[PDB]
Amino acid sequence: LFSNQIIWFVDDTNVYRVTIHKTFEGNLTEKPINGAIFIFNPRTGQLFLKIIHTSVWAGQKRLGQLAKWKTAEEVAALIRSLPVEEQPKQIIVTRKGMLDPLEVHLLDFPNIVIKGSELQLPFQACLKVEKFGDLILKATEPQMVLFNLYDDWLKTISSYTAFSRLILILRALHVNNDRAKVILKPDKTTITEPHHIWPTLTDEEWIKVEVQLKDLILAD
Numbered sequence: 001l002f003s004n005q006i007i008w009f010v011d012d013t014n015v016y017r018v019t020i021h022k023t024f025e026g027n028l029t030e031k032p033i034n035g036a037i038f039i040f041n042p043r044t045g046q047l048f049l050k051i052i053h054t055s056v057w058a059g060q061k062r063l064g065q066l067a068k069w070k071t072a073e074e075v076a077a078l079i080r081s082l083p084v085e086e087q088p089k090q091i092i093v094t095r096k097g098m099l100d101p102l103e104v105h106l107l108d109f110p111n112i113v114i115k116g117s118e119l120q121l122p123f124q125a126c127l128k129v130e131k132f133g134d135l136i137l138k139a140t141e142p143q144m145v146l147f148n149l150y151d152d153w154l155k156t157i158s159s160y161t162a163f164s165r166l167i168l169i170l171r172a173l174h175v176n177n178d179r180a181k182v183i184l185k186p187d188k189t190t191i192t193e194p195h196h197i198w199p200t201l202t203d204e205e206w207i208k209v210e211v212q213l214k215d216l217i218l219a220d
Ligand SMILES: [Cl-]
Pocket: 095, 096, 097, 098
């Protein structure tokens, strides 16, 4: 990572989502709720959040499988909307089921290398960060929203350090949301700016937070 090649991580985990309910009659219903594709540039912190509205599933079967294909279609659509100089050189899919759908959808983009990964990058943790969760839940149509997942960090730290910090945050939220949120609020006065994702912390506070997040992930 981090060279002069544009790299995107693509996480399709959260595209097809449902609420499972046991009815008074004893049967399970699985009603879809809105999902999202996360498309993430680890060098710049750019996130393209493509919100997937439940209308896309209307009249369809095997929604989990179809979701992989929907994701590939949407990644291709995003690429086509961008100038060539902004298109990724590499796409790293977080789940192996995306490899074949994305290959088939990107045949017109011979410069783009697609590969899988064993990295633990749980963008699903973002669903419990209110500023994404409510946005996704309340959407009434598909849309794409841009974010900067590194806030103002790159003013003083490298892309490598920023990526590592983000991964620790996401993995810790994933493992234990409530404890991660406490670690990320070290003082009564700790705030997150309205346009930021993460809290405003001193350098010293971040050092302590990063060790605590890592320990939380290790405890599993
Ligand atoms: Cl998969």
